[PDB]
């Protein structure tokens, strides 16, 4: 079967030189519509982004969107069982920057998370989730405005990597036998009818993630980088992540001891500001983001903890449905809606397109088109402040004007 | 070296018959003072409990407290390196019910969590953490009163079990080689300088925990039991826990499908009430407890997720320092302060004794001395409502009377 992807006639491919993106005035940007509500939110995003680009650069620049496939629609286009075509991985890597709506992974066929597959296959080791409050957003907490953090979640290792064997399977037994007999493991409480998962954490995986977090703090003049981990129980994976993170701050960024430690101070080479490098145990951290949110800024953590932390933070600022996200690697980057597919509402032009729109903001910023990105933030801030919002926000407030998904996209443009 | 434990002259040992505690009028109850602030909070707890017992039963009953050791004080009593004496495990099992202040595990000597050691060695497979709001408590959220949950956290398996090998160690290499060569593992991103942890989850471990959760919902007429897990990524450990949990509800409690599922309804044999058995993915759950707290009641989950969930919930209700906890097994139970040792304040009679006092409330309730337990809840509710509290609460409010740790214990008694 032929590829059904159509490369835009006008449009030029983004290139990478010396680890720096070279973006033309007419970049081809691949996009995955997404399953379920992706059908609603993606078009709102395309329109909002085109408007921001048109307004910022007065017609000098323009994105040539190219639809590519993954998920339920991919099976519709390429046939039963084509959930993630090879061409999709090829195209994201070739065109360097892409965006996607929510994806659904089927159940019953032994297929693992399509979102994780994209991240692992493309080696997008940074899951970047910035979380801030937008004035006017209904929130369950008293001071959501105190939250302004950026989460760097390791995206290629941890238990999130999918190495595991089913209870009572021949493989599980084999592994448990090796552990008990050759490794002398005495701590498996019930070795029978027991499932087994493997959690890897490496020095190289940890350091490339923490390096990106510290460079971001420097590049954006943030106040601190907090290593969040559960090292007091998982000494060799979570504890090693923390140790390697502090070690990297010392070896590559000149970090030095604050008082008697354990915190370090790293001098911002551009501003002379001292960035604090600290650490917090993960369970205590889930309490601290609620109780002392103002004391945290950039966060570096492992895969599973990052998933929890980014979700908990989004909820607290009232942003469960407008949280942006990016998966970034050394050769390419994939921006994404961070919510699910909400099939019950699919096609109703009802849901909030804010998450994919703000992920597009991160995308434009990543491309160096910061003026267009600033216009989207401005637009989002004005529409929410105007209380002209979708039902998920409207239902939580008094005096709001209820808008359709498409209408909220226009409200964002109207506020640019 | 002789044992330094002194068995109370007056006082009788609690016995267990047919899985039911037979508590005398003069039970001997072992207690571990705890390190750091345990020196402050334990005496407040002893006094408050004695008062509640004295008031409820008019002198007919009385606890004969017997101090036993674990932690820093144990090394002080039994010598360098005796962090957890064998006699302590023996005594808790023999006397059936005990309580402890916070414990400190040393760093640099390869010793793992003393709290986890107690739980694993005594097979206290249920970590029970009830979380409710006490009117008048300063909270970071707008409606903490909507939170009234009981967490049943599996306490004997999961990654929390401590099976792991250090990066670059001969053992780690051996394990990684076996995984890659004999198991055909292709998903370890960086196999060099890589730490490895093992996550076990068994049918027997899962079902004894979920069985206890459902029996508790029945015994206390709660509305639902929610299985929280990360099964969409960890199919064979977290996903198996969820599957086995629903299976147990069906096989032992007559659970039946609600609509087309996946939820089940279990009929309360005593009240005829229909208890809902449902499940929520763990990351979404950390958002749901903030956004829709009223929809949750009894929670059943694995070791690591339970640690996070119980900490997150305590923070949200303003209870980070007054959260009670119990570790329960089939032969004995150990109640515990759930906060840390806060050495900076140790000996200052300053910290909040509320957590260990409420854990003592759970202890009395476990012993069937519910009248004495009710008096402590009443006392706690009145003291907090009176705004006569310790600094951790006082510093967050206006119009409060600041009390010392010991003074807050009296305030609780004054409000019985």
CSV table of C-alpha atoms in Angstrom, one decimal, chain A residues 110-113 116 120 123 138-143 156-157 159-168 171-172 174-175 178-179 182-183 185 187-206 208 229-230 232-238 240 244 282-284 286-288 290-292 304-305 307-312 314-316 318 320 395-396, chain B residues 110-113 116 120 123 138-143 156-157 159-168 171-172 174-175 178-179 182-183 185 187-206 208 229-230 232-238 240 244 282-284 286-288 290-292 304-305 307-312 314-316 318 320 395-396:
chain,number,residue,atom,x,y,z
A,110,UNK,CA,-1.5,-6.8,23.4
A,111,UNK,CA,-0.5,-3.4,22.0
A,112,UNK,CA,1.3,-1.0,24.5
A,113,UNK,CA,0.7,2.7,24.8
A,116,UNK,CA,5.0,5.8,24.9
A,120,UNK,CA,10.7,5.6,22.9
A,123,UNK,CA,14.2,8.8,21.6
A,138,UNK,CA,-11.8,28.0,38.2
A,139,UNK,CA,-9.4,26.1,40.6
A,140,UNK,CA,-9.9,23.7,43.5
A,141,UNK,CA,-7.2,25.4,45.6
A,142,UNK,CA,-7.0,28.8,47.3
A,143,UNK,CA,-3.8,30.2,45.7
A,156,UNK,CA,13.0,6.8,28.1
A,157,UNK,CA,13.6,4.6,31.1
A,159,UNK,CA,9.2,1.0,35.0
A,160,UNK,CA,7.3,3.1,32.4
A,161,UNK,CA,9.5,1.3,29.8
A,162,UNK,CA,7.3,-1.8,29.7
A,163,UNK,CA,9.6,-4.7,30.6
A,164,UNK,CA,7.4,-7.1,32.5
A,165,UNK,CA,6.0,-10.7,32.5
A,166,UNK,CA,2.5,-11.9,33.3
A,167,UNK,CA,1.7,-13.9,36.5
A,168,UNK,CA,2.0,-17.7,35.9
A,171,UNK,CA,8.7,-16.3,31.3
A,172,UNK,CA,7.7,-14.9,34.8
A,174,UNK,CA,11.9,-18.3,34.6
A,175,UNK,CA,12.7,-14.8,35.8
A,178,UNK,CA,16.7,-16.9,38.3
A,179,UNK,CA,16.1,-14.1,40.9
A,182,UNK,CA,20.9,-17.3,41.0
A,183,UNK,CA,20.5,-13.8,42.6
A,185,UNK,CA,16.5,-12.9,46.3
A,187,UNK,CA,12.2,-10.6,49.4
A,188,UNK,CA,9.5,-11.7,47.0
A,189,UNK,CA,6.6,-12.3,49.4
A,190,UNK,CA,4.5,-14.6,47.2
A,191,UNK,CA,6.6,-16.1,44.3
A,192,UNK,CA,3.6,-18.0,42.9
A,193,UNK,CA,1.0,-16.3,40.6
A,194,UNK,CA,3.3,-13.3,40.7
A,195,UNK,CA,3.7,-10.7,37.9
A,196,UNK,CA,7.2,-9.1,37.6
A,197,UNK,CA,8.2,-5.6,36.3
A,198,UNK,CA,11.8,-4.3,35.8
A,199,UNK,CA,12.7,-0.7,36.6
A,200,UNK,CA,16.0,0.6,34.9
A,201,UNK,CA,17.7,3.9,35.7
A,202,UNK,CA,21.0,4.8,34.0
A,203,UNK,CA,23.7,7.4,34.4
A,204,UNK,CA,23.4,8.4,30.8
A,205,UNK,CA,19.6,8.6,30.8
A,206,UNK,CA,19.5,10.5,34.0
A,208,UNK,CA,20.9,13.9,29.6
A,229,UNK,CA,12.8,11.1,43.6
A,230,UNK,CA,11.8,8.2,46.0
A,232,UNK,CA,15.0,6.6,50.5
A,233,UNK,CA,13.3,3.3,49.4
A,234,UNK,CA,14.6,2.8,45.8
A,235,UNK,CA,18.3,3.5,46.4
A,236,UNK,CA,19.7,2.3,43.2
A,237,UNK,CA,17.2,3.7,40.7
A,238,UNK,CA,15.5,6.7,42.2
A,240,UNK,CA,20.9,7.1,41.8
A,244,UNK,CA,23.8,11.6,39.3
A,282,UNK,CA,8.4,12.3,45.9
A,283,UNK,CA,5.7,11.7,48.5
A,284,UNK,CA,6.6,14.8,50.4
A,286,UNK,CA,3.1,16.0,46.3
A,287,UNK,CA,2.4,17.7,49.7
A,288,UNK,CA,4.8,20.6,49.0
A,290,UNK,CA,0.1,22.2,47.5
A,291,UNK,CA,1.5,23.8,50.7
A,292,UNK,CA,4.5,25.7,49.4
A,304,UNK,CA,6.6,7.6,36.5
A,305,UNK,CA,7.0,10.3,39.1
A,307,UNK,CA,3.5,11.5,35.0
A,308,UNK,CA,2.0,11.9,38.5
A,309,UNK,CA,3.5,15.3,39.3
A,310,UNK,CA,2.5,16.9,36.0
A,311,UNK,CA,-1.1,15.6,36.4
A,312,UNK,CA,-1.3,16.7,40.0
A,314,UNK,CA,-2.4,20.6,36.2
A,315,UNK,CA,-5.4,19.7,38.4
A,316,UNK,CA,-4.4,22.2,41.1
A,318,UNK,CA,-7.6,24.3,37.2
A,320,UNK,CA,-6.6,19.6,33.8
A,395,UNK,CA,-19.8,24.8,34.5
A,396,UNK,CA,-17.5,25.8,37.4
B,110,UNK,CA,23.5,0.2,53.9
B,111,UNK,CA,20.5,-0.2,56.3
B,112,UNK,CA,17.0,0.0,54.6
B,113,UNK,CA,13.9,1.7,56.0
B,116,UNK,CA,9.4,-1.0,56.0
B,120,UNK,CA,7.7,-6.8,56.1
B,123,UNK,CA,3.8,-9.4,57.6
B,138,UNK,CA,-6.1,25.5,58.0
B,139,UNK,CA,-6.2,23.9,54.5
B,140,UNK,CA,-4.7,24.8,51.1
B,141,UNK,CA,-7.9,23.8,49.2
B,142,UNK,CA,-11.3,25.4,49.1
B,143,UNK,CA,-13.5,22.4,50.2
B,156,UNK,CA,4.3,-6.3,51.5
B,157,UNK,CA,5.1,-6.2,47.8
B,159,UNK,CA,9.0,-1.9,44.1
B,160,UNK,CA,8.7,-0.8,47.7
B,161,UNK,CA,10.1,-4.2,48.6
B,162,UNK,CA,13.7,-3.3,48.1
B,163,UNK,CA,14.9,-5.8,45.5
B,164,UNK,CA,17.5,-3.9,43.4
B,165,UNK,CA,21.1,-3.7,42.4
B,166,UNK,CA,23.5,-0.7,42.1
B,167,UNK,CA,24.7,0.6,38.8
B,168,UNK,CA,28.0,-1.0,37.7
B,171,UNK,CA,25.2,-8.1,40.4
B,172,UNK,CA,23.5,-5.5,38.2
B,174,UNK,CA,24.7,-10.2,35.8
B,175,UNK,CA,21.0,-9.4,36.0
B,178,UNK,CA,20.4,-12.4,31.9
B,179,UNK,CA,17.6,-10.0,30.9
B,182,UNK,CA,18.2,-15.1,28.2
B,183,UNK,CA,15.0,-13.0,28.4
B,185,UNK,CA,14.9,-7.8,26.6
B,187,UNK,CA,13.8,-2.2,26.0
B,188,UNK,CA,16.6,-1.1,28.4
B,189,UNK,CA,17.7,2.2,26.8
B,190,UNK,CA,21.2,2.4,28.4
B,191,UNK,CA,22.4,-1.0,29.7
B,192,UNK,CA,25.7,0.4,31.0
B,193,UNK,CA,26.0,2.2,34.4
B,194,UNK,CA,22.4,1.1,34.9
B,195,UNK,CA,20.7,0.5,38.3
B,196,UNK,CA,17.9,-2.2,38.3
B,197,UNK,CA,14.8,-2.6,40.5
B,198,UNK,CA,12.3,-5.4,40.6
B,199,UNK,CA,8.5,-4.9,41.1
B,200,UNK,CA,6.5,-8.0,42.1
B,201,UNK,CA,2.7,-8.1,42.4
B,202,UNK,CA,1.0,-11.4,43.3
B,203,UNK,CA,-2.5,-12.8,43.3
B,204,UNK,CA,-2.3,-13.7,46.9
B,205,UNK,CA,-0.8,-10.4,48.0
B,206,UNK,CA,-3.3,-8.4,46.0
B,208,UNK,CA,-5.6,-10.4,50.9
B,229,UNK,CA,-3.5,1.5,39.7
B,230,UNK,CA,-1.3,2.4,36.7
B,232,UNK,CA,-2.4,1.0,31.3
B,233,UNK,CA,1.4,1.0,31.4
B,234,UNK,CA,2.3,-1.7,33.9
B,235,UNK,CA,-0.1,-4.4,32.7
B,236,UNK,CA,1.3,-7.3,34.7
B,237,UNK,CA,1.7,-5.8,38.1
B,238,UNK,CA,-0.6,-2.7,38.4
B,240,UNK,CA,-3.1,-7.5,37.5
B,244,UNK,CA,-7.5,-9.6,40.7
B,282,UNK,CA,-3.4,6.5,39.4
B,283,UNK,CA,-2.3,9.8,37.7
B,284,UNK,CA,-6.0,10.7,37.0
B,286,UNK,CA,-4.3,12.4,42.0
B,287,UNK,CA,-6.4,14.9,40.0
B,288,UNK,CA,-9.8,13.4,41.0
B,290,UNK,CA,-8.8,17.4,44.3
B,291,UNK,CA,-11.6,17.9,41.8
B,292,UNK,CA,-14.2,15.3,42.8
B,304,UNK,CA,4.1,2.9,46.1
B,305,UNK,CA,0.8,4.4,44.9
B,307,UNK,CA,2.4,6.1,49.9
B,308,UNK,CA,1.8,8.9,47.4
B,309,UNK,CA,-2.0,9.0,47.7
B,310,UNK,CA,-2.1,9.0,51.5
B,311,UNK,CA,0.5,11.8,51.6
B,312,UNK,CA,-1.4,13.9,48.9
B,314,UNK,CA,-3.3,14.4,54.1
B,315,UNK,CA,-1.8,17.6,52.7
B,316,UNK,CA,-5.1,18.6,51.1
B,318,UNK,CA,-4.5,20.4,56.3
B,320,UNK,CA,0.1,16.7,57.0
B,395,UNK,CA,1.0,30.0,62.1
B,396,UNK,CA,-1.6,29.5,59.4
